[PDB]
Amino acid sequence: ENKKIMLESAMTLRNITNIKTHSPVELLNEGKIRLEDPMDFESQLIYPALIMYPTQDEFDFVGEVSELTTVQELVDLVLEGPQERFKKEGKENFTPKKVLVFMETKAGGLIKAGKKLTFHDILKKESPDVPLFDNALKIYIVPKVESEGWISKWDKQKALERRSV
Ligand SMILES: [Mg+2]
Numbered sequence: 001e002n003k004k005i006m007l008e009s010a011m012t013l014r015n016i017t018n019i020k021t022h023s024p025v026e027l028l029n030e031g032k033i034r035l036e037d038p039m040d041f042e043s044q045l046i047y048p049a050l051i052m053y054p055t056q057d058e059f060d061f062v063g064e065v066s067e068l069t070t071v072q073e074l075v076d077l078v079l080e081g082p083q084e085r086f087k088k089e090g091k092e093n094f095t096p097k098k099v100l101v102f103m104e105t106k107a108g109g110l111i112k113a114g115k116k117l118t119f120h121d122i123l124k125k126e127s128p129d130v131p132l133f134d135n136a137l138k139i140y141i142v143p144k145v146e147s148e149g150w151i152s153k154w155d156k157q158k159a160l161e162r163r164s165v
Helices: 002-013 071-080 119-124 144-153 156-161
Strands: 045-053 058-066 099-104 110-112 137-143
Touching (some): 058 071, 071 099, 071 119, 071 137, 099 144, 137 144
Antiparallel strands (some): 045 058
16 A cells, blocks of 8 residues: 555656556556655656557567656667568668657647657646556657658547547
8 A cells, every 4th residue: 555655646746647548458467667666756657668650560568668768768779679570661761860759648639759858757747748558658659751641640539439438
Protein backbone atom coordinates (compact mmCIF):
# COMPACT_ATOMS: atom_id res chain seq x y z
CA GLU A 1 0.00 0.00 0.00
CA ASN A 2 2.82 2.38 1.04
CA LYS A 3 4.65 1.96 -2.32
CA LYS A 4 1.45 2.13 -4.35
CA ILE A 5 0.12 5.29 -2.66
CA MET A 6 3.54 6.99 -3.05
CA LEU A 7 3.58 6.24 -6.78
CA GLU A 8 0.03 7.62 -7.20
CA SER A 9 0.89 10.81 -5.26
CA ALA A 10 4.13 11.19 -7.24
CA MET A 11 2.36 10.79 -10.60
CA THR A 12 -0.38 13.35 -9.75
CA LEU A 13 2.37 15.85 -8.79
CA ARG A 14 3.82 15.27 -12.28
CA ASN A 15 0.35 16.03 -13.81
CA ILE A 16 0.37 12.68 -15.68
CA THR A 17 -2.80 11.70 -17.54
CA ASN A 18 -3.28 7.91 -17.94
CA ILE A 19 -5.70 6.43 -20.47
CA LYS A 20 -6.69 2.76 -20.13
CA THR A 21 -7.35 0.83 -23.36
CA HIS A 22 -9.51 -2.27 -23.86
CA SER A 23 -6.90 -4.43 -25.63
CA PRO A 24 -3.36 -3.51 -24.51
CA VAL A 25 -0.57 -5.66 -25.99
CA GLU A 26 0.49 -8.71 -23.95
CA LEU A 27 3.99 -7.23 -23.46
CA LEU A 28 2.42 -4.74 -20.98
CA ASN A 29 0.62 -7.42 -18.85
CA GLU A 30 2.89 -7.03 -15.77
CA GLY A 31 2.20 -3.27 -15.50
CA LYS A 32 5.79 -2.29 -14.67
CA ILE A 33 5.90 1.41 -13.75
CA ARG A 34 7.92 2.61 -10.73
CA LEU A 35 9.97 5.27 -8.99
CA GLU A 36 13.67 4.32 -9.06
CA ASP A 37 13.67 4.83 -5.28
CA PRO A 38 10.16 3.69 -4.25
CA MET A 39 9.89 5.98 -1.17
CA ASP A 40 11.30 9.12 -2.88
CA PHE A 41 8.88 11.06 -5.13
CA GLU A 42 11.84 13.04 -6.67
CA SER A 43 13.61 9.94 -7.98
CA GLN A 44 13.27 9.06 -11.66
CA LEU A 45 9.89 7.69 -12.74
CA ILE A 46 10.48 4.71 -15.07
CA TYR A 47 7.83 3.44 -17.53
CA PRO A 48 7.71 1.09 -20.53
CA ALA A 49 7.48 2.36 -24.12
CA LEU A 50 5.73 1.13 -27.25
CA ILE A 51 7.47 2.54 -30.34
CA MET A 52 5.24 2.28 -33.42
CA TYR A 53 6.48 2.41 -37.03
CA PRO A 54 3.08 2.59 -38.78
CA THR A 55 4.47 3.04 -42.34
CA GLN A 56 6.56 -0.18 -41.88
CA ASP A 57 3.93 -2.31 -40.01
CA GLU A 58 6.37 -2.81 -37.14
CA PHE A 59 6.84 -1.81 -33.52
CA ASP A 60 9.44 -2.03 -30.74
CA PHE A 61 8.99 -2.54 -27.01
CA VAL A 62 11.38 -1.02 -24.45
CA GLY A 63 10.70 -2.29 -20.93
CA GLU A 64 12.20 0.68 -19.03
CA VAL A 65 12.50 4.32 -20.11
CA SER A 66 13.34 7.04 -17.57
CA GLU A 67 11.23 10.22 -17.59
CA LEU A 68 14.51 12.21 -17.87
CA THR A 69 15.23 10.58 -21.27
CA THR A 70 14.81 12.98 -24.21
CA VAL A 71 12.83 12.15 -27.34
CA GLN A 72 16.14 12.34 -29.29
CA GLU A 73 17.83 9.88 -26.89
CA LEU A 74 15.03 7.30 -27.33
CA VAL A 75 15.08 7.73 -31.15
CA ASP A 76 18.88 7.29 -31.14
CA LEU A 77 18.48 4.07 -29.10
CA VAL A 78 15.82 2.35 -31.23
CA LEU A 79 17.46 3.32 -34.57
CA GLU A 80 21.15 2.61 -33.61
CA GLY A 81 21.28 -1.14 -34.29
CA PRO A 82 21.15 -2.78 -37.75
CA GLN A 83 17.87 -1.66 -39.33
CA GLU A 84 17.01 -4.96 -41.05
CA ARG A 85 13.53 -5.15 -39.45
CA PHE A 86 12.33 -2.33 -41.78
CA LYS A 87 11.60 -4.12 -45.08
CA LYS A 88 9.23 -1.79 -46.97
CA GLU A 89 9.41 1.23 -49.28
CA GLY A 90 10.99 4.17 -47.45
CA LYS A 91 13.15 2.10 -45.03
CA GLU A 92 16.14 4.32 -45.94
CA ASN A 93 14.49 7.35 -44.26
CA PHE A 94 14.57 5.85 -40.73
CA THR A 95 17.48 7.88 -39.35
CA PRO A 96 17.48 10.19 -36.28
CA LYS A 97 17.33 13.40 -38.39
CA LYS A 98 14.92 12.18 -41.08
CA VAL A 99 12.14 10.93 -38.73
CA LEU A 100 9.55 12.89 -36.78
CA VAL A 101 8.06 11.63 -33.50
CA PHE A 102 4.31 11.88 -32.82
CA MET A 103 2.25 11.20 -29.70
CA GLU A 104 -1.51 10.93 -29.20
CA THR A 105 -3.25 13.64 -27.13
CA LYS A 106 -6.19 13.31 -24.72
CA ALA A 107 -8.45 14.63 -27.52
CA GLY A 108 -7.36 11.74 -29.81
CA GLY A 109 -5.28 14.02 -32.04
CA LEU A 110 -1.54 13.94 -32.72
CA ILE A 111 1.29 16.24 -31.61
CA LYS A 112 4.85 16.39 -32.94
CA ALA A 113 7.08 15.65 -29.92
CA GLY A 114 10.07 18.03 -29.78
CA LYS A 115 13.31 16.04 -30.03
CA LYS A 116 15.04 18.05 -27.27
CA LEU A 117 12.18 17.61 -24.74
CA THR A 118 12.21 15.10 -21.89
CA PHE A 119 9.25 12.75 -21.44
CA HIS A 120 8.79 14.31 -17.96
CA ASP A 121 8.23 17.72 -19.57
CA ILE A 122 5.88 16.38 -22.29
CA LEU A 123 3.67 14.52 -19.77
CA LYS A 124 3.61 17.45 -17.27
CA LYS A 125 2.07 20.12 -19.56
CA GLU A 126 -1.61 20.90 -18.91
CA SER A 127 -2.00 21.83 -22.59
CA PRO A 128 -1.24 20.05 -24.83
CA ASP A 129 -2.37 17.07 -22.73
CA VAL A 130 -0.24 14.07 -23.79
CA PRO A 131 -1.15 10.88 -21.84
CA LEU A 132 0.38 7.58 -20.92
CA PHE A 133 -1.59 4.66 -22.37
CA ASP A 134 -1.91 1.72 -19.94
CA ASN A 135 0.85 3.32 -17.80
CA ALA A 136 3.30 3.25 -20.72
CA LEU A 137 4.63 5.63 -23.37
CA LYS A 138 3.27 5.26 -26.90
CA ILE A 139 5.18 7.05 -29.69
CA TYR A 140 4.96 6.96 -33.49
CA ILE A 141 8.18 7.25 -35.51
CA VAL A 142 7.40 8.40 -39.08
CA PRO A 143 9.75 9.79 -41.75
CA LYS A 144 9.30 13.55 -42.25
CA VAL A 145 8.62 12.93 -45.97
CA GLU A 146 5.73 10.51 -45.17
CA SER A 147 4.34 12.46 -42.18
CA GLU A 148 1.79 14.69 -43.97
CA GLY A 149 0.20 11.64 -45.63
CA TRP A 150 0.21 9.61 -42.41
CA ILE A 151 -1.37 12.47 -40.39
CA SER A 152 -4.06 12.79 -43.10
CA LYS A 153 -5.01 9.09 -42.63
CA TRP A 154 -5.07 9.23 -38.77
CA ASP A 155 -8.59 8.36 -37.58
CA LYS A 156 -9.49 10.18 -34.36
CA GLN A 157 -12.72 8.17 -33.91
CA LYS A 158 -10.75 4.89 -34.29
CA ALA A 159 -8.23 6.14 -31.72
CA LEU A 160 -10.95 6.99 -29.19
CA GLU A 161 -12.57 3.56 -29.80
CA ARG A 162 -9.36 1.88 -28.49
CA ARG A 163 -10.13 3.33 -25.02
CA SER A 164 -12.14 1.75 -22.18
CA VAL A 165 -14.36 4.82 -21.60
MG1 LIG B 1 -0.78 16.12 -18.61
